[PDB]
Symmetry: D3
Subunit: 158 residues, 6 copies
């Protein structure tokens, strides 16, 4: 049983995130989608909201477990008995900061291997931040979000 963790702020989870976690489940026996509380980022949705949205959005994937956490990433991964940490790679600025995080996590937990997946071309130019920005100005983001997430984002901004 190979266990992988897919951590992030997921504020909110997008179709880009869904693509990454789906490809993770095709590679590893069990995938933990781990939502960081991230108070420093002032998330639009609470951790409880983000967990519920991701749970509904991944219910069709049998080997996904959605969990919220505030611990240090490396500690949470060890405590989940994960040996693989999944991250999606979008742009150069993401890549460089991801290298930093990966080298720090390797110092904290050497047996946790960071692996990067590339999203579909369809999602390679979207982010949670960009979708929220469009929605803040009432633009149509139905294409970029799971149905349940779109409703919740519309409701939140209403």
């Amino acid at each position: 049983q190979k266990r992988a963790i897919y951590p992030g702020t997921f504020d909110p989870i997008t179709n880009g995130h869904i693509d990454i976690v789906t490809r993770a489940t095709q590679m590893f026996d069990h995938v933990i989608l781990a939502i960081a509380a991230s108070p420093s980022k002032k998330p639009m949705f609470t951790l409880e909201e983000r967990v519920a949205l991701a749970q509904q959005a991944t219910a069709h994937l049998g080997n996904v477990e959605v969990v919220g956490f505030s611990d240090l990433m490396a500690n949470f991964a060890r405590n989940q008995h994960a040996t693989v940490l999944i991250r999606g790679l979008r742009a150069v600025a993401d890549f460089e900061y991801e290298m930093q995080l990966a080298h720090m996590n390797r110092h904290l937990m050497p047996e946790l291997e960071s692996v990067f997946l590339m999203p579909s071309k369809e999602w390679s130019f979207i982010s949670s931040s960009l979708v929220k920005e469009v929605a803040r100005h009432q633009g149509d983001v139905t294409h970029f979000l799971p149905e349940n997430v779109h409703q919740a984002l519309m409701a939140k901004l209403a």
Copy 2:
């Protein structure tokens, strides 16, 4: 009549912005310099201030129209009957975020073509943020701003 829109926060408009809008007017019949309210960015100048500064700074360009807006970019462009969106390209981090915005705008308004211009070497290393930072510490920024803007920035910080 080809109509182009040059959107941005313009907080405040710099000589780099003046260079871009000038080259836009040499290419398209009518250029709308569109100032986004951008409350999330906490602009130093109000939208009304930024519009007045840009109006004075572009008065010598006959086919520039300065307008403020809070709508979604794509909607404002459609409502202005613009089919070209101008953006200046400065650095790598700008380029990647501009690609995101352009692909999102293309989803929202497919007939709005995003085109990028390269500023003069003189302005390729300045930004509104950098000029404000120098001025906050009382450094001489006369070279980087239109006369009216420099006065207003000096007055604002006084």
Copy 3:
């Protein structure tokens, strides 16, 4: 208000990415010159011109021409005031900025405009397509039908 734009490249061979860019250019400017450089291409200049002409024949305001001068020199003699460049990724951007500053030095009245291809074509180039096809990979999706036929014939011999 009648702008002449030039879209230069080697187009060895022209891809759907090039077709995307030139199509966007024709919706923006009155006349677009698709300019094919004479200089070790897989296809000859005459082949590259003929392929590009057939692939753009449906665009009424495209003119396909070959050139061997410095691009700026040809643009000047063609009375172009707009230079079309497609931007795919960071790597192009950095090299295109260099070329844009050189071209502005050589011909100040030629404005470089950077267009963005569809996500569908943002990761391809003529060189990658040729390499994949040379090594028995499927590139049908990335090329006009006429180019695909010509590429298969070229690789068969």
Copy 4:
């Protein structure tokens, strides 16, 4: 749950950076094929395979094989569903993203996975090592002992 992964490259010659990557891969996947491309290398394909075999003999689930097809074609015929790529810096990232989208077009069932080397090996490549050694620089730290011996012999003649 028994994943077959392929780690392709020219490995001319295999470095400690490659050893780092393939070692990480073997801790993640059941079987890893270290696939050496036939195509102007300093070492012949037979030399490169023998060097890589000796340098990975301690890894029980590594299989070193040569191939001359398109990488995706070989991966398909090997029933690999995971493609291992090492990421050193921004420059690789940009080119690897291109290749990853092409490989997904060619073989959708092959997932590209990017691994990160130790800081120790993040700035080296086979080409840089060869260039330094060719010009009388010390590269002992960057190579397996067997490769170091073979490189010295090659440069002596």
Copy 5:
């Protein structure tokens, strides 16, 4: 007597900073480690705290002088009679912003030459921000900080 200035926010000073300033002292007769007040960055440590930490962390380097400042960088460098400004280069996003700052400083003080040093591989993936983030979640950062700084960071977060 060649005088160099190594400016930054140093919130807090890391082993990466120590590496850079050490290599600066091997190249120039006198190095001023200059700590910017940086109120816009909301530093975790006060300027007085950051100065004291850096002073203790560099006490073994005889030709380092630690000073705090709120002036414009170029003015402070001129007033220190420095003709070399040291900056460490970590990642692409740093590099581009450093080019901006260097070209602005060259406009403000042409005789102040900006020079960039590359940190050891050991520190090329750490930053003050990343260390603080790990420590906020109680992760072990002993490896990345001078002893006195680690204690102060532990105490601050306690």
Copy 6:
């Protein structure tokens, strides 16, 4: 307190960007060696040295020398403790970081220092200048007078 710095490159030919960098170096360090690598240049090593000498003769503390060893080996034998590199754009930065870590491995006592050229020269290189000039573009602004004369003569034949 008497630092010896080396500024290595191919300088084929030396440009105003190189002159900018070496001038900045001489204002920082006591002695600067402009080191020209022997290795398919447009100008011979003897031409490149003579061109660089004339273009820097006004700088009293510059020494122009040719070398064929590994750059680090030559720097060691010259008792240089400072390595001068010019940084133009992101692309250089990424490759220079690689080289800097290799050079630190080869000669730990050689510190790499990166200088920034004027905005005027931030987009040029010897290769771009040669390519533009080869294709009948004006490069007078980017070169010392003596180099411009020599480049015209070289391209005439």
